[PDB]
């Protein structure tokens, strides 16, 4: 008996769902010996981490198998998140947290006589991010899995900041010298991507010929939802040479993110992601369990364009439909616009992608044609509605026809998407009312806001188990999948007991992070000190230099009368500066030398410490963030759209000091201004000071203490061996400081003094903090996703624990 139900023996029936200790030790031993081809006598700590990661993967995959099985079966509309970069951090713990295996693994690994913490620290950060964008993608991928959406993450598959002589010194990030156990290569799903060549017009549709081919290799990484047994995918592509000296012009496409031919190489990078991706989707949807097959394309596919990097998806989808599936250009266009939605992240108007036609022309000729065609019909519709206005015309035109005419990628994205959104109320308003005024005026509804958010898993359960364990006891464990549940904590604004545990939790995380700075940067760390952190990328606009000014200023208050009640302060400033950014590299040395002084002079002792947090990255943010008291979100008004970091710090018991811009604004709304340290010029206050004109002249003198530091710095005080070294900051401070530092030097320096004041009264602090913590549930990246699903993708969230046994 028994036939080709013999093939039904090929199952995970008895190899999925058994998550006990015996089983975990047994898998661990299988991997360390069989997968790794090692033994207890030859295995380094790295060998053990791997064996443990593999042990965890198996469970992740088990659910990924059932998950994909559910999607094929239910045939849900699918979401595709298209981003150049994905800031993933480390995988292990996160996976153990989401699958609920932390505890068994803890014990499994104790029994084998290994320190799980040691293993967990061997993992390098997946170099797939460089900013807040790659990190927004990563929260979304988490929230989509958790929210039960059939999402996918499409991007590329590619940096160690080190300090030396107080200077930043870039160094290579070999994140894959030993491999990535988390990812799987699908060579069997490779795809050819084409560059260059030419287009041949025939009666049997247009053809692109004589092209240079680059292969696109998919690497899959499982993305686990939180405890619903749901597991999504992040497919990242690598480039390969098909079979003279160009057998690397492929590799280049994938070797560094944010790299003339350095502009070009970026273009090929963007197209490579876009072509491979679209082909992949089309392939997946042609295989769905489900005239014309594509008629339903937009009801089964939603593609999200994170910024203008993958703006080629529009003409590329059109190229596929018309030249390949061969449908009418007008049908393909309706399928297109309904597929795509565009997310604008840049406040800027002078920072949008714009490629020169002559370039798009050589590399992607069939695409330029398609683009010119989208345009004509585009303007053609405009001329209809507004006959005279020849200005609205050339304005709204996808192409900037001038010197060497350029294509406006941002415009292409808008015409080709059914929905455009911003990431904060005021930001989304500028995008609609100003930046793309013309566009909004036309199809007004097309525009909208989706306030950024942050994942409660990585940024609380994982990093701050102290805080989580605490909250849990008071308001149960529903805040995890519903962060607006944190409100219920206000019911403790009185519980003086509570605030005790609370600040205690902050001390513990604050104490641990201490053992770290000492063991790392080797400097006595004042565990009682008020940890004040500013960890944004190193740039002019982000200030930091303004904090430094406040770094030194506090350094004098302890020198001009060394016995006046001063609130102890450990100041942390971390971040990276582009290897080409001359200025910031200087602000980096500046902060270093300054630190040296304020640290070694024994007069200040355990009063104030300065620390440059080297190699700021996801995993580091995970160390600092929980142990921070004051969050430094102080960037000049009208420069920040959102501010993800702002939110991790408010979620974890830190308190915020900053301006009325970006995320601070919506934070004020939920907590209240009183519960936030606002200050400095409002966007309007600056909206005037420019007309008046600005010269650091005034502020310098009138502001005594300013003169101090201001000169201290220049007078070679912090730079003895080269006092004239920072003589480059002063010139672009007085003269060309496009960011008005001094102008706020007032509000700031004083502002802080109210902090030292609130800090001195513990009770005042903790009551305020709890007010910040119980108003952070709105900035959950789950709520941000719910929104996207309703008003954009038209897909519904699910709380269906996928079944392991079926």
């Amino acid at each position: 008996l028994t036939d080709q139900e013999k093939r039904r023996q090929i199952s995970i029936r008895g190899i999925v769902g058994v998550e006990n200790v015996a089983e975990l030790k047994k898998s661990f031993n299988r991997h360390l010996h069989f997968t790794l081809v090692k033994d207890r006598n030859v295995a380094t700590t790295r060998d053990y981490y791997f064996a443990l990661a593999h042990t965890v993967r198996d469970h992740l995959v088990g659910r990924w198998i059932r998950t994909q099985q559910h999607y094929y079966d239910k045939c849900p509309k699918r979401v595709y998140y298209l981003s150049l970069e994905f800031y993933m951090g480390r995988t292990l713990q996160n996976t153990m947290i989401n699958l609920g295996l932390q505890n068994a693994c803890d014990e499994a690994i104790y029994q084998l006589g290994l320190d799980i913490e040691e293993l967990e620290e061997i993992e390098e950060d997946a170099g797939l991010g460089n900013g807040g964008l790659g990190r927004l993608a990563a929260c979304f991928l988490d929230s989509m899995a958790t929210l039960g959406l059939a999402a996918y993450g499409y991007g590329i598959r590619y940096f160690n900041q080190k300090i030396r002589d107080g200077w930043q010194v870039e160094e290579a990030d070999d994140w894959l010298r030993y491999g990535n156990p988390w990812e799987k290569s699908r060579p069997e799903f490779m795809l050819p991507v084409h560059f260059y060549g030419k287009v041949e017009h025939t009666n049997t549709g247009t053809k692109w010929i004589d092209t240079q081919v680059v292969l696109a290799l998919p690497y899959d990484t499982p993305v686990p939802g939180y405890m619903n047994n749901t597991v999504n995918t992040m497919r990242l592509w690598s480039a390969r040479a098909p079979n003279v000296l160009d057998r690397n012009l492929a590799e280049n496409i994938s070797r560094v993110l944010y790299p003339f031919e350095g502009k070009e190489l970026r273009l090929k990078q963007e197209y490579f992601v876009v072509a491979a991706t679209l082909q992949d989707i089309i392939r997946r949807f042609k295989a769905s369990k489900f005239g014309t097959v594509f008629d339903a394309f937009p009801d089964q596919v939603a593609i999200q364009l994170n910024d203008t990097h993958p703006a080629l998806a529009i003409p590329e989808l059109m190229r596929i439909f018309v030249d390949i599936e061969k449908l009418p250009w007008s049908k393909a266009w309706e399928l297109t616009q309904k597929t795509f939605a565009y997310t604008n992240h840049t406040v800027l108007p002078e920072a949008l992608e714009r490629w020169p036609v002559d370039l798009v022309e050589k590399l992607l000729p069939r695409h330029l044609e398609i683009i010119y065609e989208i345009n004509q019909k585009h303007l053609d519709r405009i001329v209809a509605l507004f006959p005279k206005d020849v200005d609205r015309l050339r304005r709204m035109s996808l192409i900037e026809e001038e010197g060497s005419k350029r294509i406006n990628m941002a415009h292409l994205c808008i015409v080709g998407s059914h929905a455009v959104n911003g990431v904060a109320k005021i930001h989304s308003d500028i995008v609609k009312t100003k930046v793309f005024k013309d566009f909004s005026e036309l199809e007004p509804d097309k525009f909208q806001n989706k306030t950024n958010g942050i994942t409660p898993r990585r940024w609380l359960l994982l990093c701050n188990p102290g805080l989580a364990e605490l909250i849990a006891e008071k308001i149960g464990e529903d805040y995890v999948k519903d962060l607006s549940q944190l409100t219920k904590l206000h019911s403790f604004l009185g519980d003086d007991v509570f605030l005790r545990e609370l600040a205690k939790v902050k001390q513990e995380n604050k104490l641990k992070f201490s053992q770290f700075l000492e063991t790392e940067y080797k400097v006595k760390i004042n565990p009682s000190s008020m940890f004040d952190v500013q960890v944004k990328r190193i740039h002019e606009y982000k200030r930091q230099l303004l904090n430094c000014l406040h770094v030194i200023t506090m350094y004098n208050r302890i020198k001009k009368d060394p016995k006046k009640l001063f609130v102890p302060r450990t100041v942390i400033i971390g971040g990276k500066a582009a290897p080409g950014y001359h200025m910031a590299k200087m602000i980096i040395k500046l902060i270093t030398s300054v630190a040296d002084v304020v640290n070694n002079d024994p007069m200040v002792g355990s009063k104030l410490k300065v620390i440059f947090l080297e190699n700021y990255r996801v995993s580091l943010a995970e160390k600092v963030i929980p142990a921070t008291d004051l969050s430094e979100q102080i960037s000049t008004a009208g420069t920040e759209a959102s501010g993800t970091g702002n939110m991790k710090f408010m979620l974890n018991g830190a308190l915020t000091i900053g301006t009325m811009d970006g995320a601070n604004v919506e934070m004020a709304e939920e907590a209240g201004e009183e519960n936030l340290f606002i200050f400095g010029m409002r966007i309007d206050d600056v909206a005037a000071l420019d007309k008046k004109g600005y010269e650091a002249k005034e502020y310098y003198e009138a502001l005594p203490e300013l003169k101090l530091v201001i000169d201290q710095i220049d007078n070679g005080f912090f730079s003895p061996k080269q006092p004239d070294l920072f003589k480059d900051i002063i010139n672009m401070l007085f003269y060309h400081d496009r960011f008005k530092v001094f102008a706020d030097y007032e509000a700031y320096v004083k502002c802080q003094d109210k902090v030292s004041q609130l800090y001195m009264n513990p009770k005042a602090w903790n009551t305020m903090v709890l007010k910040n913590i119980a108003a952070s549930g709105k900035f959950s990246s789950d709520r941000t996703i719910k929104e996207y699903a309703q008003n954009i993708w038209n897909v519904e969230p699910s709380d269906l624990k996928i079944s392991l046994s079926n």
Binding site: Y71, Y72, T233, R283, R284, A287
Partner: peptide, 4 residues
Amino acid sequence: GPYY
């Protein structure tokens, strides 16, 4: 055939 199914394409995951």
